Amino acid sequence: ARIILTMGIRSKASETDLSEILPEEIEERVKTAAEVSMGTEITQTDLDNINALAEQIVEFAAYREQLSNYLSARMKAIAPNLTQLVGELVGARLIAHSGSLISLAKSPASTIQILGAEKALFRALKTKHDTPKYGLLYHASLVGQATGKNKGKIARVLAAKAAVSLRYDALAEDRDDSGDIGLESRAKVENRLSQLEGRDLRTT
Amino acid sequence: QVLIDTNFINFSIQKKVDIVRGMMDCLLAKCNPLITDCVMAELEKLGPKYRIALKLARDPRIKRLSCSHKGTYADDCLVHRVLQHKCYIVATNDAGLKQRIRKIPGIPLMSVGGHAYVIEKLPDVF
């Protein structure tokens, strides 16, 4: 959409710079496709409401960056000891699945792993099978930093320490509000992670 | 559209009938007789003492149609033009070719006997 406000017609295409939008290889590439392309010409009445979708696309994405900014304010409002650990988006969704913050901290640690993956869980218990091991916690920034089966072993240590961080956030009437427990929680997982990546199954 | 052997030409000469004018007597309708390219390659290969048949074979009312073969042998050029279409009407007097076509369904075979020609598997004889 940002191209349409810059590119316009195919002869406006070759002349106008795309340094700001997709540069240095694709700018040459859209210049190449500009001269030979199977599409038609478009009138200046038809370049009015593609010329006003290019506004309304951009104003959505410019609103969404204000919108994820709004949760990052609300993470550090409600549970900042949580969102120093797992990030704004997971903690937006772990609260969203349970409901209130108080309802989430009353759950134990091991049910904060599998808070998302409830469809594959109760299938795997009602028929005798294997429980899913990540859950909604899998899209944390830290499970992705691990590899292999170590995505499982960090998914315990997070859901333990996130359960430690949540109860300091739901159930402390005084909050230091700096993520002071949470950054002590994340440094324990990074010690757990870099221990667990140093160990390897191979033979030396 | 009637295919023609070497043998049907040879016994046409001994029995004193025209091809085109004499076929219409047996057949009672109009016909376009057409010698293939393999069959003309036999009539030349028969040699000097069959050359009066080779004159009568090249007649502009006798049509010619080519074929895509690697061979002269027209006894098996002919059946292969018959299975794949079944519009033709074979004119032979070879004994082995008659047995090769009487097993094929629905192909009017035509031979020469006595005075005029005879047809076999036409349902519309008269």
């Binding site: 190449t32 001269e35 030979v36 199977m38 009445t45 038809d46 104003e59 | -």
Partner: protein
């Protein structure tokens, strides 16, 4: 004696030199015909001499529409000034090998000493040039044929079909698919707006039912409160400022400015909708005006979307096309005429508005009959 040849491309022309002529009695053979798939053998025939590329894609269309006439363009005239050595007009001409019999006289009209040959001899060489393709050109062709065929294929087609983009009807399709999602969302975010704005003023949404104006007063009055100018923009103005005094819901500040930008998003988006609506009301007035006279721009544009084009209203039987005692009578009696209006929109070049009004008054008197 086929000395030079000429192969045409979307990337300009080419003038080749025949180094060796293939032997011409023996041209149906397996040997000389299987040489021309083999680039080692075909090179001994052909050397490139010239390659003048087209100056632009628009000049290509003018030149590609000139070969199919049979005539000689500017550049095709201009290339042959270089490459062909000037020979006599009567004795010992110069031979050029042309792909077309029809192009033949138009060269000799311009260049009287050039004899144009299109035998099955000469056309065998030109067909050889297509097969080995870009390897003959030794990289002088900047870009490729494979992109150049595609655009020049569509542009040659669009010229001879001759449809303007203003005649196109996918603009009716995409706009209907866009107006319905605007209507899907404008109430949706405004219902979100009230469920944000219920924490501050539950009374104003009762006064203001329109989603377009309810998102403006949130932009206008962020807090309580009299002496409000745009609240008169008058009966609801005093009914709101007094209701602003009688407030029940609670009161933060950045959180409401979230709702301010969120209620900003509604009023800008419905402004786009009223902008998009007039475009569709105009393109209906452009593309299918005889259909626009009967039912109007909106319901006319709905039918083209459910047909998937404007063509599939013309192809369908009038009983089959469907719009919604009057059901049994008028919904059939209009759908006959609704079919007929959509025929004469499709197959005219510039459709007339006048016959739709003529077709409209026929439908009126059956409504008078009811």
């Amino acid at each position: 004696p086929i000395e030079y040849l000429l192969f045409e491309e979307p990337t300009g022309y080419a003038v080749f030199k025949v180094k060796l002529q293939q032997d011409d009695i023996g041209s149906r053979l397996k040997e000389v015909q299987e040489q021309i798939n083999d680039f080692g053998a075909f090179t001994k025939l052909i050397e490139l001499v010239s390659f003048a590329p087209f100056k632009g894609a628009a000049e290509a269309l003018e030149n590609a529409n000139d070969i199919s006439e049979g005539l000689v363009s500017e550049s095709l005239k201009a290339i042959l000034d270089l490459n062909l050595p000037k020979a006599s007009s009567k004795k010992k001409n110069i031979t050029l090998a042309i792909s077309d019999k029809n192009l033949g006289p138009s060269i000799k009209e311009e260049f009287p000493y050039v004899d144009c040959i299109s035998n099955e001899l000469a056309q065998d060489l030109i067909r050889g040039v297509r097969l080995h393709g870009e390897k003959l050109f030794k990289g002088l062709q900047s870009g490729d044929l494979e992109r150049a065929q595609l655009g020049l294929g569509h542009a040659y087609s669009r010229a001879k079909v001759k449809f303007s983009v203003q005649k196109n009807d996918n603009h009716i399709i995409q706009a209907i698919a866009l107006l319905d999602q605007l209507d899907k969302d404008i109430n949706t975010f405004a219902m979100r707006v009230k469920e944000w704005y219920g924490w501050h003023f539950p009374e104003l949404a009762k006064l203001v039912p329109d989603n377009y104006t309810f998102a403006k007063l949130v932009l206008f009055i962020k807090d309580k409160a009299x002496x409000x100018x745009x609240x008169x923009x008058x009966x609801x103005x005093x009914x709101x400022x007094x209701x602003x005094x009688x407030x029940x819901x609670x009161x933060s500040e950045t959180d409401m400015e979230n709702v301010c930008v969120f209620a900003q998003r509604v009023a800008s988006l419905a402004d786009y909708r009223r902008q998009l609506y007039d475009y569709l009301c105009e393109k209906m007035h452009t593309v299918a005006p005889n259909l626009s006279e009967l039912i109007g721009e909106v319901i006319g544009a709905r039918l083209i979307s459910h047909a998937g084009s404007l063509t599939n209203l013309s192809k369908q039987a009038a009983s089959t096309v469907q719009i919604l005692k009057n059901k049994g009578r008028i919904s059939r009696y209009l759908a006959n005429k609704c079919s007929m209006a959509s025929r004469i929109d499709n197959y005219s070049e510039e459709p007339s508005n006048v016959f739709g009004s003529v077709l409209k008054k026929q439908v009126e008197q059956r409504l008078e009959f009811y």
